Structure formats: structure tokens, C-alpha cells
């Protein structure tokens, strides 16, 4: 088991977009106080992940990466590959240099 | 039309302002907390119940966190047991003898804990039906419900009778130090050999060295079994086994205990006359056999079925065989022909299970899971289990060869864990099977379709020139019947004897007695030679002995026989039923896996109504697969005496 990775499973409500929650408080799923340990009505939110050679296709490690595009006020700045064309010469040619 | 909601801080103003509230427009006071209606020429008081101090932690919430939490933890600890128990069962060794020791009392902990803390969690007040029934099934304590010493001594009692069954040998007597286990040493000789004095030695020299020991221990364990049976709301242990099959609070669909008693005694009583016709039959070959061992009217002997339970008559086949002359289906050789090994056999299990239309399993089974036993360096073991370890890990144990009986229980194997990763979708607790009788039928049923000839030549097992005649349908008809419907009436009566013996009804100076005598006017089969109420031969059998309620293998035939017959009615198959074949029939699949996905979650009565159509079981399948048998078996009986008689025995 690869007990690295933990996942908050409980939370008191739902995340915003764009939003990282690394609170360690200890959940109360009930009325009785925590008091910061678990116990009746209380458990830790960051439960672990479990990850063996021998686990189910979807139950793998999967690692994901999710590339979110911000266009704001701000310049330009990640743009793509713009890939350049052969040179000719002596050629009547509809060209394009940089715009 | 549409309307709303008006609120109002007093009363007062509530009077003066009713008139303004249109019709279907509620009033609603706070100082009061009383709720009105706006009606025609009025407001009607809105009938309220109690008011409750806002819980917004109900024990609903409370226990759904629980049992989240409880369902992820649970599945890595059993997940590892899983493993290390399947790294012994395929290399026996002293370190993998510690790692169920420790996973095992780990495993055990961590569930008491969980019950213990589920036992806050009353289920009066939990209106999910899931979280409801698991932790139903959480809060069952079984042994600890009872005071530790009663555990610890029933514990120490069925570790006794354990031990006892699996140490049990008997030594013959010109002989001393030559002594046969009852697996294999016992059974091997008994089934091979059809002499009526060896067979007989064998039978009354294991019930005295066993029956003797284990009757003050059976007792024993009845009576506490009896104990926490009460101390969990149950009128005898009996009950306590019947309560799985218990449904409640399924409007439609409830089944009670008694229910399960009731119609299986229905289910037997029907079955009888078939099951008269095959005794019948059987007795006439033994006189065939030994004329003066056994009489036209008497009951069968004890030791004279191939099983020392009289559980199965397989061992009879050959000896009561329709014709002896016609040879059998098998396609064994043919195997050893095309060059096959326990690897193709799962390959071509699979691509059955793929023609039904039910997807392909993935790869990470076949690498961890062997299919031959592991040479001679590791000791493994070759029962027929299914490892559902968890995580999306499943593996099969079976020392599997080129072989049709091989092949059969590899079908049967791939089933089990085919109907494991099905319900896939269900938590840890709902894991499982709807009841004990599933998990075998669902690997029963396909298996015995691809052993059809039809099958068989269909992917080449079977060259396509066999004929198909009624002599080797008969004999096929007359095996099925001697290994399934022959343990019927033992598996009904002994779960029937099991379960009043826990209730008591029958003193304990006549249980045994009582046994033999519903041996001969139930199951037809008398004992060569009497004893005393010191034997406790039904406590002989594995599951008396290791606590296991007997009541599947009965359940579990009708149960497969409904299947099958669902199969066939789904696939539109004609003629006769032991030659249906469920191969290259997608719809047939796709309507098993209707239910394969359901799982436990829901009534197994939900579950058997909706693959064939009828809420309660029904033997109509028996009807249907052994027409021709029953046919042949009325007509064969000219000679055979229909029935058996209680009067006549071995000895007597």
C-alpha cells in the first residue's frame, strides 16, 4: 500500500472552483465536539490512499494534470509552438514574417 | 393556480391579516409554531407532531460518516489478509503460517471495534434501507454477544470438533499402527472399493471413533449455540442461520425464516416422487450388484451410496449406470489431443464467458493467480476457492489439469469470482452474495452449459460427428440426478435435523435415532449395522463440525435450476433442458448480469423473481431437465419398487 497520498473525504462544504483545502482538523460528522481527536462522530477528513501493484484497473494510482488557460488584462505570455515554413526566393510568394 | 407561505410574529396579527391571505396561501406563527391552511371562508390548523430542537445531526448522518469511514479502512486490512492468506494457500510455509495468525487477529479486532461502536447506532431510527442492513450486519456480534466465557469455551469447543474431523482416523484391527485418514485414506477405499465388509468396517469404525468422541462435545455446542442464539433474538441456532435469508421491511418482497422452512418442505414433498423413482432404480441395480445385501423394499444402506453421509450416489454411477455399455461424454482426451493445459482451459472459459456477451476480465488475475500446483517446493493447496481479496484483486485456487472434472470446476471457479467483481459497485459489507445459495448456482449453471455437447463442438472440444441419442441423454439425466437431485433429500433432512436439534424438539437420546429414522422414510437409506445415542454420525459431516449451515446445497440447486431454466427461456432454447447451452447468447448474459450487479443490497427473493419471474423458488426446473429421466425411470421401475421400506435393515 502506498499510504503517501491522502484525499479529503469529508468536508464541511463544497470546495470552490480552483480551491485547495490542506486543513488537518479533525471532522465531526456529528454534534458531539471533537475536541482536535477522533472518535464517536469523529474522524479524520484526509483519509489515506491505498495503492498496490495488484489493485483494480480503476482503483490504480492514476496521475492527473489538468492545464487550466488563464487570458486576462495581463499580456500573453504561453503561447503555441508556431511552426515556420521552408524559405524560397526570387519567387512572387504571399509571405509572413512575425505578423 | 399557484400559492405560498405567510408568516406572521403573533397571532394578532395574524387575525387581522387572514383576511388578505388568498385560498391555498399557508399561515404560519412563530410564537405559536402552529401552522394553518387559508381555506374557504376560514384557515384549518395544520396538525403538527412534536417539535424538535433542531437535530441536524441525526444518527442517519452519523452513521452514513461511520460506515463511509468503517468501508474504507475495512477494505485495506482484509484486502492484505486476502493476500497473505493467498501466499499460503500457495506456498505453505511457518512464515505464512504467523500471517493469518497476525491478519487474522487483526482482522478480528478491528471488526469487533466496529461493532462495538455500530451498537450506538440503533436501527430504529436509520430509514436507508443500505445503511440499515449493514449495519445490521455490523452490529452482529454472534459469539460475543454472550458473556467472554461462554465465547471462550465455544470457541474452544468447535476448535475441539475441528480438530477431531480433521485428525479423525480409525485403525484396522489385525493391524494397530495401520490407520487411514477419512480424507483421503477413508474415502478412497470406500469409493473404489464395492465390497459390502470393507465398506462396512470403514463405515462403522469411523462413526464409533468419531461419532463416540464428538457427542458430549456436539451437545455442548448445541446448547451454546443454542445460548447466543436467544441472546441475538433467535429461538434456536437454527434460526439464527435462517436469519440471512430473513427479509423485512421490503413491502412486497419480506421473507421470514419460517417462510424459508415452509417452502422447503413444499419444494421437497413435490420433489419426492422423482426422488422415489431414482431410489428406486438405484436399489434395483444394487440388487443387480448384491442380491443378498440388499432387499427390493428395504431402504438403502448407509455405506452402499459412495458416501458415508450418504451424500452423493456419483460413485453409484457406474454401478447403477442405465446402460454400462454405452460410453460416456467426455472430451477429455481430446484435450491431450489439441495439446491443452489448465492455461487454455481458463482462456476458453473466458472466451465462453465473452460469447454469453458479458465483458472480458482483465489481466491482473491471470498473472496472480496459478493454475497449476506450484511443483514441489512450495506446498499449495488445490480446493475450489475464490479469493474475492478486494482492491480489485481476484484470484482463483485450483491445482487445475488437463481434465474435464478440472475443467467443470475451473467454469465453477472463473463463476464465483465473475459474480464477485460484478457487484463491484456495492460497499465492502454488500460485497457479497444475496445469500449462501448464490454464489455456487451462478458457477453451476454456465459451467454445466459449457459442458452440453453443443458447447463442446462449438469451440471443438466435441468432434462435430457425435450423436446425439436418448441412451447417453438418459445417462447424463441419471449422473445429474444421482449427484444433484440424489443429495437433495440428504441435504434437506440433515439442515432439517440440525435445525431441531438446536430447537430441542427432538430429545437428545433420540436425535440420532431420529436421524436413521428420517433416513429411511425421508431420504430412503437405512444404517448396516445399530448403535446407541453415543454416535452422533450427523455431527460426523465437515459442516456440523466446522460450523456450516447445510441449508445452502439445497437452496442452491433450486436455485441454479431456476437460472438455468431463465438462461434457456432467455436464449429460446428447444428441446430438451440438459442440452441447453447458454454459448454465443449475448441477451442471456446481459440478463444475468442484471442481477450480478444488484448484489446483496437487495432481497435475494427480488433477486430470484427477477431472473425468472417468480418471487418465491419453484421446482419447475426439475420437472423440465429430468423429463426424459423420470420417463425412463417410471418405465424401468417395473421391477423397482417405488418408495423404500422403514421396517427392513442390513442387520435386520
Same mark, same amino acid.
Given at each position: 500500500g502506498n499510504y503517501n497520498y491522502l484525499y479529503r473525504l469529508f468536508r464541511k462544504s463544497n470546495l470552490k472552483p480552483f480551491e485547495r483545502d490542506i486543513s488537518t482538523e479533525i471532522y465531526q460528522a456529528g454534534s458531539t465536539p471533537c475536541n482536535g481527536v477522533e472518535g464517536f462522530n469523529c474522524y479524520f477528513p484526509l483519509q489515506s490512499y491505498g495503492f498496490q501493484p495488484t489493485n483494480g484497473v480503476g482503483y490504480q494510482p492514476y496521475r492527473v494534470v489538468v492545464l487550466s488557460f488563464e487570458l486576462l488584462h495581463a499580456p500573453a505570455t504561453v503561447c503555441g509552438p508556431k511552426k515556420s515554413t521552408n524559405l524560397v526566393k526570387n519567387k512572387c510568394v504571399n509571405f509572413n514574417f512575425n505578423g | 393556480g399557484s400559492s405560498g407561505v405567510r408568516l406572521w410574529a403573533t397571532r394578532q396579527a395574524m387575525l387581522g391579516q387572514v383576511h388578505e391571505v388568498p385560498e391555498g396561501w399557508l399561515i404560519f406563527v412563530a410564537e405559536q409554531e402552529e401552522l394553518y391552511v387559508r381555506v374557504q371562508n376560514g384557515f384549518r390548523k395544520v396538525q403538527l407532531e412534536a417539535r424538535t430542537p433542531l437535530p441536524r445531526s441525526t444518527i442517519e448522518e452519523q452513521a452514513k460518516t461511520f460506515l463511509d469511514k468503517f468501508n474504507h479502512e475495512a477494505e485495506d486490512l482484509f484486502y492484505q489478509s486476502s493476500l497473505a492468506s493467498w501466499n499460503y494457500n500457495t506456498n505453505i510455509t511457518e512464515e505464512n503460517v504467523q500471517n493469518m495468525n497476525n491478519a487474522g487477529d487483526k482482522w478480528s479486532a478491528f471488526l469487533k471495534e466496529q461493532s462495538t461502536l455500530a451498537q450506538m447506532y440503533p436501527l430504529q431510527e436509520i430509514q436507508n434501507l443500505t445503511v440499515k442492513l449493514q449495519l445490521q450486519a455490523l452490529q452482529q456480534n454472534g459469539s460475543s454477544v454472550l458473556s467472554e466465557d461462554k465465547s471462550k469455551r465455544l470457541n474452544t469447543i468447535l476448535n475441539t470438533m475441528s480438530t477431531i474431523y480433521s485428525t479423525g482416523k480409525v485403525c484396522n484391527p489385525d493391524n494397530p499402527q495401520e490407520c487411514l485418514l477419512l480424507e483421503p485414506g477413508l474415502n478412497e477405499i470406500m469409493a473404489n472399493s464395492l465390497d459390502y465388509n470393507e465398506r462396512l468396517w470403514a463405515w462403522e469404525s469411523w462413526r464409533s471413533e468419531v461419532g463416540k468422541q464428538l457427542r458430549p462435545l456436539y451437545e455442548e455446542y448445541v446448547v451454546l449455540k443454542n445460548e447466543m442464539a436467544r441472546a441475538n433474538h433467535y429461538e434456536d441456532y437454527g434460526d439464527y442461520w435462517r436469519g440471512d435469508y430473513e427479509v423485512n421491511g421490503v413491502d412486497g418482497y419480506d421473507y421470514s425464516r419460517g417462510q424459508l422452512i415452509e417452502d422447503v418442505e413444499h419444494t421437497f414433498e413435490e420433489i419426492k416422487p422423482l426422488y422415489e423413482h431414482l431410489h428406486a432404480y438405484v436399489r434395483a441395480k444394487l440388487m443387480n450388484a448384491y442380491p443378498s445385501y440388499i432387499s427390493p423394499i428395504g431402504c438403502l444402506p448407509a455405506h452402499l451410496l459412495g458416501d458415508m453421509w450418504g451424500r452423493f450416489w456419483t460413485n453409484l454411477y457406474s454401478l447403477t449406470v442405465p446402460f454400462g455399455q454405452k460410453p460416456n461424454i467426455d472430451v477429455t482426451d481430446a484435450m491431450v489431443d489439441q495439446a491443452w493445459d489448465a492455461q487454455r482451459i481458463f482462456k476458453e472459459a473466458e472466451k465462453f464467458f465473452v460469447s454469453v456477451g458479458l465483458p472480458n476480465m482483465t489481466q491482473g488475475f491471470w498473472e496472480n493467480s496459478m493454475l497449476t500446483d506450484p511443483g514441489n517446493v512450495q506446498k499449495a493447496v488445490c480446493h475450489p476457492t475464490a479469493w474475492d481479496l478486494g482492491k480489485g484483486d481476484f484470484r482463483i485456487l485450483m491445482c487445475t489439469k488437463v481434465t474435464m472434472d478440472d475443467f467443470l470446476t475451473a467454469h465453477h471457479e472463473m463463476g464465483h469470482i465473475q459474480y464477485d467483481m460484478?457487484? *463491484? *459497485?456495492?460497499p465492502f459489507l454488500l460485497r457479497n452474495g444475496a445469500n449462501e445459495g448464490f454464489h455456487e448456482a451462478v458457477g453451476e449453471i454456465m459451467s454445466l452449459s459449457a459442458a452440453t455437447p453443443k458447447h463442446l463442438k462449438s469451440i471443438g472440444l466435441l468432434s462435430p460427428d457425435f450423436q446425439e441419442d436418448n441412451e447417453t441423454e438418459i445417462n447424463f439425466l441419471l449422473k445429474q440426478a444421482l449427484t444433484i437431485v440424489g443429495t437433495l433429500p440428504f441435504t434437506y433432512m440433515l439442515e432439517k435435523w440440525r435445525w431441531m436439534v438446536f430447537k430441542g424438539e427432538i430429545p437428545k437420546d433420540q436425535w440420532m435415532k431420529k436421524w436413521w429414522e428420517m433416513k429411511r422414510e425421508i431420504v430412503g437409506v437405512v444404517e448396516p449395522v445399530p448403535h446407541d445415542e453415543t454416535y452422533c454420525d450427523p455431527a460426523s459431516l465437515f459442516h456440523v463440525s466446522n460450523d456450516y449451515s447445510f441449508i445452502r446445497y439445497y437452496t442452491r440447486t433450486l436455485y441454479q435450476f431456476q437460472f438455468q431454466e431463465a438462461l434457456c427461456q432467455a436464449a429460446k432454447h428447444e428441446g430438451p433442458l440438459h442440452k441447453c447451452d447458454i454459448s454465443n447468447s449475448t441477451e442471456a448474459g446481459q440478463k444475468l448480469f442484471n442481477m450480478l450487479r444488484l448484489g446483496k443490497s437487495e432481497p435475494w427473493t427480488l433477486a430470484l423473481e427477477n431472473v425468472v419471474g417468480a418471487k418465491n423458488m419453484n421446482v419447475r426446473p426439475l420437472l423440465n431437465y429430468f423429463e426424459p429421466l423420470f420417463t425412463w425411470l417410471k418405465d424401468q421401475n417395473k421391477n423397482s419398487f417405488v418408495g423404500w421400506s422403514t421396517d427392513w435393515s442390513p442387520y435386520a
Open positions: - | 460484478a457487484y *463491484a *459497485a456495492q
